[PDB]
Design a protein around this nucleic acid. Structure first.
Ligand SMILES: Nc1nc2c(ncn2[C@@H]2O[C@@H]3COP(=O)(O)O[C@@H]4[C@H](O)[C@@H](COP(=O)(O)O[C@H]3[C@H]2O)O[C@H]4n2cnc3c(N)ncnc32)c(=O)[nH]1
Ligand SMILES: Nc1nc2c(ncn2[C@@H]2O[C@@H]3COP(=O)(O)O[C@@H]4[C@H](O)[C@@H](COP(=O)(O)O[C@H]3[C@H]2O)O[C@H]4n2cnc3c(N)ncnc32)c(=O)[nH]1
Ligand SMILES: Nc1nc2c(ncn2[C@@H]2O[C@@H]3COP(=O)(O)O[C@@H]4[C@H](O)[C@@H](COP(=O)(O)O[C@H]3[C@H]2O)O[C@H]4n2cnc3c(N)ncnc32)c(=O)[nH]1
Ligand SMILES: Nc1nc2c(ncn2[C@@H]2O[C@@H]3COP(=O)(O)O[C@@H]4[C@H](O)[C@@H](COP(=O)(O)O[C@H]3[C@H]2O)O[C@H]4n2cnc3c(N)ncnc32)c(=O)[nH]1
Ligand SMILES: [Zn+2]
Ligand SMILES: [Zn+2]
Ligand SMILES: [Zn+2]
Ligand SMILES: [Zn+2]
Lengths: 362, 369, 369, 362
DNA sequence: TTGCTCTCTTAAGAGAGCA
DNA sequence: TTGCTCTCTTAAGAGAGCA
């Protein structure tokens, strides 16, 4: 349409970069020639047009990149300016490109390693291993990682005070690091967390971090370490057997890492009515990727909704589950609603007898 | 063995002139104000096989101008990846490169979808951090073609005090929804015009989110978004078919009418009748209650349609208030509120789980006229 | 013409291995976890006279190892100053260089002064942004030798609602001072030990800051800091002599006893008697009321001593409450509160300016037993 | 004392850098030899000692730099480890060095230029000029500056609605940019602001920004532009003449840029009782540095405390003051306390007649 | 078993005949 | 009046005789 707008080569380079080399009206990639091995004729495969009718109309930011076909459908005056205003559409297009181009700063993250004193001695997880696993997924620490070890219990054992001090220790550290807002919008950083400790302690870590913020669990794997064994693996089916009817105490057995024998459960809890969540082939190596953790939580909560409806009384939990799953179990039970859960764990200093160690509830 | 000028121009173009590893803008110096191209076109596999990530089986000449091997980096990111090859291996750099490039391509091919005011409303009544990232809402908006003129509004309720969610707490929630939000929309009004749509995501007390919905319904157009435990602000599955919303009508009687919503979880009847003796329970539910069920916005719209039907039926049964006991996702709480704006002008008394009374349901806010 | 290794080692040493223009740590890569020296020793005046800031009268060889011409910079800051010489001229770069070096030298020669918990308490009752920077408190602490194990506690009151500073507002202020703060000190307790001192700075409602002082007095040791309109958290003048705190005793009578504090400004009597008819006014003042008068902590201590005297005298005059009308700096409001902890256990009724009643003084909080 | 701890050269370089090359117990600069032209003997002028008695005792971060004199007063075992723990003192010393080394990120800042439509046309202030003035003082923008121009008034004039829309426009922009927290501690950025507009509008900008945050005013100077004329200049004395006694309206004349004639004040305000704040030599060029602005505010508030005490009635303001001073005047009057001020300004389209244009108050 | 001199590597702008 | 080839500049690590 009538005239054409003139641009020097420097202006062309600027407009091509801020648009990512696509037509702003149809989205066609105007670098097709290069992708094909043909030389780029930058000034032939694109037209540059001011977005507004004819004193910043020529400022680079108010200049548009269009393919020739879309440029030909634009009515223009003898100077190459549009007759109708496309400023809104153009500024919107630039905004979508910037949001995508700035997405890497959405990775700002706090590293957090939590261990028992025992696994810290036998199987220390250094910050370096968490950082490289974080980096490969786009999660970017900006300061020193938090590396915590759960305090050893005194004579009173792991009583309510012990567990409340654990939760305060973890949350004090997290909140200080979650004040370190940054990036394009001032968002709090993401949390990148790995745990290796007894299952009740790991559930208390889940109680501490919750599941209502940008948070990514990582997992320590005997063979693959902090790297995910297989990003393309599909989560397994989580099989459920419902509890028999009766008045005995309700028990939830989680047979994920291994098959828990019923006799060990009824030894610790006489009269137990066992409901069980299992997978077809229990294995210590089952946490192939993060989706497995998400799938476990989804299946678990579906069944806890059924079990909590069955009775007002506590649900007694006997879990053989991987560490990353134990954290997600704790984080799931952080709504306002609180059913009473009594967590049993095997005491390795008392011939692996299931022992009640933790209570979650109102 | 140098990268030619056409290829460097392509690298700058397909990355939009930002660092692929940290997102900083490399086309301008914001400190002193001069346009400048201060990035570096960086090689993943080096020319020298002795360099970082060096390999003997790498034909350097066959890849000098291969943009699969060339990243736009700030000088600092570039200096670090060349000093720590084991920490920044080829396969990890290549995957981040391809992922960065694909996000830009998808933004460039997304058609304009209009404008909206981003609105985040979140509570502090959990015993854990609760925080919706702004970037993630803006990104979900952008995936649908929606842009905004600023990063929008973010309201965080004051936390409960030493007495829990008491009368003062709920006064404060009201003031946040009915005064603070309105004052911030007024200020930003003008930039967005006469009737700007609100792109809204909530994660807050269920009675609060119902009050928000009522307040924003009608007054403004609305595009609902949802926070999801696995997918955050991204819709889990745009192809998922909504579930069936099963309704159970109340028994006949003179007892108080209760509307139970069992969507996130099965609400036990014993807990309703303990709070409201003689309750005549009507229930909306899905076949498999689950926290994860908000798969796409069509799920939200199907809930609305199913409940709009049932609410008019229940208000006919009696002129006395309807008592709500709801285990529902946060986005559905907002939609429930929006149904009560001007049409369903019956009094609704909202019950909620009370951590100060052993998880019993107690009465919180009254909605309606 | 290259900088020798000894001089580069000096540059890295005197800058503590951080970028002199942006403060980033250049001794470590936090993303992937490897110690690495990723900075650059940069020349202000270049070797080539054609380069950025180039000059013909610069003997490059006489300055190759002159640390007055050499800055430790990140690669990005370095790349920008070399691309915009007019935006980053020699005289501006040299001044920032010398200022960076002198701050490090002063920190290194500051003797250890102990530990303290940083505590910021601020309101939202102004019609403008109100925000005390954390860095500035930590820096004032460090100038006195005080360090902390974390950046400390920062409490921001909820803003007034649509009814102004009503009963709900003051309940919330109380909960912030008496529950939120105590819960955060409990959590951080253990790291700081049995009796950790609080390095406290307030900028909040005068009655709130008095309530804070009462709550923190005795319970904990205290190092008071002050926000100043010109100097921020830095003491304006450590050599300034405190002013004389002039006291005017109340007239004899049976009327209500009023304590007027005219330190920031002269409180008009008409405004006291309008709020409290029959008031018998005692007044503490300085010769020249001014918002700027908190020149150093000795000024604060002199106010405390002057007022401790007068408060015991006034409580003897009558067992009925003392009515406070105060135009005082925020740090003195905190100290007033601390005097009322366990010693002055008389009832004090705090009046404040009310924007909802045309700037009249109205009653707010009651302090005491 | 007995043994000595051994370090390789790489460890020495790390310890010297994290301590800034000073003795951690006495603060002596151990780079004295270099400053004198003598070669550095790094291993002779300093000793490196673990801070804690004898498994991170040898980690670089737990290693101390001491001068030989202070090292000799440390009792050590045969391995060179201290017998008493200096970990607390050492970690404190490192913390003070880091706080100083990170001080440049305390400069993160939002640029803000505010102008009238008139001065935007006649004397546009580009962002570049503000940025370079910011940069020279250590203030560092991270995104595009805000550049606002006050809306022209409609038929109703600059009424209360006009002025409330100004204040909302300014505060909306500021607060969005003050969400861009960052740096070491998550602080909101500093505001760097320059105004060039009519004095009432500039006072409304001061009402919008306040004086209770990290904020630095800049000033446009006819000769020196946005750069300060003279950083070493001492502020002038601000002379005050008190108002005569009577019942007429109270007027505050500010004769800073120029001497305001009394007849112009009494023409606009019959019966005016004039109090005046002036300097010895009024001049358009008087804003030599930022301390001048601070000094003006301190002197002004001292006198406003006197005048507001004199009468409950409004104070009528007739100001010939520089633009930067007009902003600080507006920001001063943002406490909870509010006396009524009526601002008169010369109407350049009505032969420069002083005209009441703005009211500040409860 | 540094711990000084000189070569090497990687990025960039500059400019020189020509398009 | 780019708009490809080759030289130039600035930083760094590497390593080679020697300390
Ligand atoms: N076989 C079996 N195991 C049972 C039974 N009843 C309970 N369990 C417990 O389940 C866990 C299974 O081992 P895991 O490696 O899959 O998960 C553990 C667990 O989450 C956490 C703490 O260890 P532990 O107390 O031994 O719990 C073990 C078992 O007692 O950390 C995980 N963990 C432990 N070591 C590692 C490691 N090297 N790598 C990764 N994760 C680890 C029952 O009947 N049978
Ligand atoms: N399981 C269960 N929950 C019940 C029962 N009776 C009442 N409830 C309440 O329903 C909500 C279910 O959690 P949700 O995540 O599906 O939805 C909540 C809700 O819309 C809002 C506020 O949370 P809350 O007050 O805890 O209400 C919770 C429960 O108390 O926000 C949603 N929400 C909370 N956490 C998240 C999260 N991490 N991600 C997304 N949305 C969230 C009953 O019997 N059983
Ligand atoms: N001029 C004047 N002020 C009066 C009168 N009657 C009562 N007042 C109140 O005194 C305070 C004086 O301001 P200040 O800055 O010296 O101290 C305040 C005060 O300690 C706290 C809360 O502010 P506010 O409620 O406005 O109380 C203001 C006034 O209403 O914080 C201090 N504070 C406020 N702003 C700042 C700031 N920018 N920098 C530092 N401290 C600040 C009366 O007749 N006249
Ligand atoms: N001579 C004189 N001036 C009087 C009298 N009564 C009132 N005034 C006003 O004072 C201002 C003095 O000029 P300034 O340059 O020192 O400050 C102005 C003012 O702060 C703002 C708007 O300008 P204006 O409306 O002309 O106010 C002028 C006068 O009317 O911006 C400042 N300003 C204007 N132009 C510039 C500039 N080029 N550079 C810097 N600042 C400027 C009275 O009796 N006599
Ligand atoms: Zn097109
Ligand atoms: Zn980068
Ligand atoms: Zn830097
Ligand atoms: Zn010493």
């Amino acid at each position: 349409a009538s005239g054409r707008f003139n641009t020097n080569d420097e202006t062309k380079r600027i407009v091509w970069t801020q648009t990512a080399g696509h037509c702003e009206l149809c989205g066609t990639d105007l670098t097709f020639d290069y992708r094909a091995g043909k030389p780029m004729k930058w000034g032939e495969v694109a037209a540059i047009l001011p977005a507004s009718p004819k004193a910043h109309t020529n400022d680079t930011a108010n200049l548009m990149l269009l393919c020739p076909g879309c440029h030909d459908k634009i009515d223009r005056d003898a100077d190459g300016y549009p007759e109708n205003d496309l400023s809104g559409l153009h500024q919107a297009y630039l905004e979508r490109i910037r949001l995508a181009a700035t997405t890497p700063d959405g990775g700002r993250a706090i590293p957090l390693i939590v261990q028992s004193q025992h696994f810290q001695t036998i199987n220390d997880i250094p910050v370096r291993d968490l950082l490289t696993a974080m980096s490969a997924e786009g999660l970017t620490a900006f300061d020193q990682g938090i590396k915590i070890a759960f305090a050893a219990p005194g004579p009173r054992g792991r009583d309510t005070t012990y567990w409340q001090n654990v939760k305060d220790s973890v949350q004090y550290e997290l909140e200080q690091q979650l004040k370190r807002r940054g990036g394009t919008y001032g968002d709090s950083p993401a949390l990148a967390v790995v745990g290796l400790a007894d299952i009740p302690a790991l559930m208390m870590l889940g109680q501490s971090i919750g599941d209502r913020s940008k948070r990514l669990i990582f997992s320590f794997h005997r063979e693959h370490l902090l790297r995910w064994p297989d990003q393309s693996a599909e989560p397994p089916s989580f099989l459920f057997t419902p509890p028999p009817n009766g008045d005995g105490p309700l028990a939830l057995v989680l047979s994920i890492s291994a098959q828990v024998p019923v006799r060990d459960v009824t030894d610790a809890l006489p009269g137990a009515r066992i409901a069980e969540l299992s997978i077809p082939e229990p294995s210590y190596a089952m946490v192939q990727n993060r989706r497995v953790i998400h799938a476990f939580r989804d299946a678990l909560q579906i069944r806890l909704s059924q079990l909590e409806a069955l009775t007002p009384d506590p649900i007694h939990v006997f879990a053989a589950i991987p560490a990353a799953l134990a954290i997600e179990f704790g984080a799931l039970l952080t709504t306002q609603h609180q059913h009473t859960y009594l967590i049993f764990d095997r005491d390795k200093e008392n011939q692996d007898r299931f022992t009640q160690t933790l209570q979650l509830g109102p």
